[PDB]
Scaffold this active site. Structure first.
Site, PDB file in Angstrom:
ATOM      1  N   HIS A  34     -13.510  -1.521  -3.348  1.00  0.00           N
ATOM      2  CA  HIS A  34     -12.358  -0.734  -3.763  1.00  0.00           C
ATOM      3  C   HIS A  34     -12.327  -0.529  -5.288  1.00  0.00           C
ATOM      4  CE1 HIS A  34     -10.555  -0.830   0.294  1.00  0.00           C
ATOM      5  NE2 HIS A  34     -11.168  -1.997   0.367  1.00  0.00           N
ATOM      6  N   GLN A  58       0.822  -1.201   0.000  1.00  0.00           N
ATOM      7  CA  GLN A  58       0.000   0.000   0.000  1.00  0.00           C
ATOM      8  C   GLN A  58       0.861   1.259   0.000  1.00  0.00           C
ATOM      9  OE1 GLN A  58      -2.777   0.080   3.315  1.00  0.00           O
ATOM     10  NE2 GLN A  58      -3.508   2.155   2.827  1.00  0.00           N
ATOM     11  N   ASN A  91      -9.349   3.026   0.907  1.00  0.00           N
ATOM     12  CA  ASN A  91     -10.351   3.970   1.414  1.00  0.00           C
ATOM     13  C   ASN A  91     -10.709   3.716   2.877  1.00  0.00           C
ATOM     14  OD1 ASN A  91     -12.560   1.913   1.415  1.00  0.00           O
ATOM     15  ND2 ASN A  91     -12.268   2.046  -0.818  1.00  0.00           N
TER      16      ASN A  91
END
Lengths: 165, 11
Positions: free
Chosen positions: A122, A54, A98
């Site tokens: 997502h 990420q 998110n």
């Protein structure tokens, strides 16, 4: 209509296709942020073997904007974009992080393997079309208790080869 | 579990 870009990091480079045809708002936002060098010096701050890595968090940039924003004027979050032909299957899916419905800003992840429980939660807006072996090395990175790599790959630059907007 | 959040990482 697709977008093409290379993310150059301190630990390898990734070639990416953006699905501007199926997730236009997420691709547009991302490219608008690429334009103003937003992602330069950001890190990949969360890395879980057999899941994903990420990145894209403005707040963790190791250096222009100090907080995470979208690429649109005003920087407000944008709505999710789902498509049945776009699923979190296999290595190299590019998707939006998110905190629930329609809270897309700048954080994203790239899959190491399938995680289809994330489908319709997502916005998938791209895929890695080159550099899958860089990704495979990232998957092996040692990480702390919070899953931050001890040596996070840091974005040197993003080269955009085609922006269809 | 296996999520990709931004602030509250959940199970």
């Amino acid at each position: 209509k697709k977008g093409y870009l290379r993310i150059v990091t301190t630990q390898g480079s990734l070639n990416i296709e953006l699905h501007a045809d199926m997730a236009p708002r997420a691709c547009d936002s991302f490219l608008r942020l690429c334009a103003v060098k937003y992602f330069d010096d950001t890190i990949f701050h969360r890395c879980i073997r057999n899941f994903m890595i990420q990145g894209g968090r403005a707040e963790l940039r190791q250096p222009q904007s100090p907080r995470s924003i979208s690429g649109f004027p005003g920087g407000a979050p944008f709505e999710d974009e789902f498509d049945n032909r776009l699923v979190h299957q296999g290595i190299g899916v590019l998707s939006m992080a998110n905190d629930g419905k329609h809270s897309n800003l700048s954080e994203f992840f790239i899959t190491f393997k399938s995680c289809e429980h994330l489908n319709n939660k997502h916005t998938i807006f791209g895929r890695v079309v080159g550099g899958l072996d860089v990704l495979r090395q990232w998957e092996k990175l040692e990480t702390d208790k919070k899953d931050k790599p001890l040596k996070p790959p840091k974005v040197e630059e993003i080269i955009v080869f085609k922006n269809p907007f | 579990x296996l999520l990709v959040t931004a602030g509250l990482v959940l199970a």
